[PDB]
Structure formats: C-alpha cells, structure tokens
Amino acid sequence: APKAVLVGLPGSGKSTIGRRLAKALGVGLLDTDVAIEQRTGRSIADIFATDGEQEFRRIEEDVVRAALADHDGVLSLGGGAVTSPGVRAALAGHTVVYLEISAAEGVRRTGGNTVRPLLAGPDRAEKYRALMAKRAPLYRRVATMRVDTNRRNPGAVVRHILSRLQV
Numbered sequence: 001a002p003k004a005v006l007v008g009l010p011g012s013g014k015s016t017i018g019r020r021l022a023k024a025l026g027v028g029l030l031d032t033d034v035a036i037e038q039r040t041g042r043s044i045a046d047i048f049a050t051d052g053e054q055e056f057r058r059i060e061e062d063v064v065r066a067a068l069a070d071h072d073g074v075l076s077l078g079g080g081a082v083t084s085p086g087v088r089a090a091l092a093g094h095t096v097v098y099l100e101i102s103a104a105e106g107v108r109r110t111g112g113n114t115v116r117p118l119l120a121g122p123d124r125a126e127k128y129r130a131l132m133a134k135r136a137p138l139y140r141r142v143a144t145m146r147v148d149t150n151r152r153n154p155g156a157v158v159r160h161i162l163s164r165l166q167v
C-alpha cells in the first residue's frame with residue numbers, strides 16, 4: 001500500500017510535495033489524474049464533457065482503489081476524489097496526509113506569476129473559497145496526518161512528513 005496518500009486543495013502542493021517526498025523516500029510517484037488519462041487515452045476534461053461527472057467519478061474511484069491496493073510509493077489524489085463516498089471508504093486504514101492551506105495562500109499559489117491578481121476580477125478567488133468550503137471538511141475526515149503548508153517551504157513540509165513516517 002502507499003507509504004503516503006496526499007490530499008489537499010489546489011495549491012496545497014500535491015504535485016510539489018508528491019515529487020520531493022517520493023524522491024526523499026526513493027519510491028514511485030502515482031498521480032490519479034495522470035493514471036486516469038493513461039488508462040483511458042482521454043483527457044480529464046474530455047471524459048467530463050462526454051460522459052459527465054458521475055461517470056468520471058466512477059472511473060476515478062476504480063483507479064484510486066487499484067492504486068491503494070497496488071502502489072507502494074507516494075500516491076497523489078485528484079482534488080475531487082474525496083467527494084466519492086467509495087473513495088472515502090477505500091482510504092480507511094491508509095496513511096493519508098492532508099496538505100492544509102488557507103484560501104489566501106491557495107489563490108496565490110494557483111494565481112500565476114502576475115503581480116496584480118485582484119485586477120483580473122474577484123471571481124476565481126470566490127470559486128476557490130467555495131471549493132475549500134466543500135472540500136476541506138472531507139480532507140479533515142479522511143486524514144491521518146494533517147500538515148499545515150501555510151508559510152512553509154516544500155523542504156520544511158517534506159521534513160515534517162518524513163519525521164512522522166519512519167519505519
């Protein structure tokens with residue numbers, strides 16, 4: 001089973017910490033969004049557009065269940081996977097690290113290299129706040145380790161995790 005399963009909002013660092021954590025442990029890294037596209041030949045948006053959300057979620061939940069059973073490294077979960085009660089069930093008993101972030105930091109990390117984000121309009125940040133409202137309670141539910149990534153370097157987040165995942 002995975003050494004760690006990482007969950008969190010956009011910006012929390014699933015990609016970044018997933019990579020560094022896999023490197024530090026010397027283990028493989030599996031991202032469930034990439035796994036879905038590699039298993040289907042279709043891009044995530046395309047499955048959504050063509051088959052819709054329930055069908056994407058069904059597929060995602062099989063990819064997730066398969067990785068939990070088969071992968072021994074770090075597993076990074078798609079942001080919406082935890083919306084599926086079947087995914088929340090399958091996670092139980094696993095090491096699930098929830099990468100915490102605030103809406104403020106969240107928006108900043110997903111806001112690009114533009115120096116003035118407010119000029120674009122408030123809509124993206126409002127959608128981000130709403131997303132956090134929906135998702136954060138679910139991440140808290142499935143977590144076995146909660147890690148606050150607000151004003152921590154990726155290096156510091158990785159250390160924190162590694163010190164709490166010795167064998």
Ligand SMILES: Nc1ncnc2c1ncn2[C@@H]1O[C@H](COP(=O)(O)OP(=O)(O)O)[C@@H](O)[C@H]1O
Binds near residue numbers: 153
């Ligand atoms: N602990 C952190 N401190 C500062 N910036 C971070 C941290 N974690 C991630 N970021 C930055 O935010 C962006 C989004 O991170 P990413 O790891 O893709 O998140 P996710 O896969 O969770 O959406 C990247 O440019 C990354 O450098």
Ligand SMILES: [Cl-]
Binds near residue numbers: 158
């Ligand atoms: Cl590191």
